[PDB]
Symmetry: C7
Subunit: 25 residues, 7 copies
């Protein structure tokens, strides 16, 4: 579904955020 | 559910953000 | 509900994040 | 509602996040 | 609706987070 | 709808969170 | 749908956040 996919797209962004926090290092 | 599963994937990512503090 | 449950899981992850930033800064 | 309730718990966890930053200043 | 209100509460919490990080930063 | 609008409000607050970091440097 | 659309906008906001964070880490 479009909603579930957008939500997974939110998850991936958060993981992208996690790698940026783990660029402190 | 696909929606519930995706919400759980979000929580996991957030936990990952948390663990990245220490790391 | 599984949706409510998953949302609560998200709330808990953010509480984790709060704690972690609290501690790291406390150092 | 259970969904609305859970959503408010998320908001409170975010406020906790905020407060944690308010004590680092 | 309760659901839309809860979401708006989340948004407000995020805005609160935004403010705190600016101050935290500015405290430097 | 009221839900979509509130979600869009969430995105905007996150963008505001982003701007807070863009202003750190 | 407008809800899927608003969720995608949230995701983009989070990527915007990640990018600003990298610029942070990089400017030090």
């Amino acid at each position: 579904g479009e909603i579930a996919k957008a939500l997974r797209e939110i998850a991936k962004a958060l993981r992208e955020x996690a790698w940026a926090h783990r660029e402190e290092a």
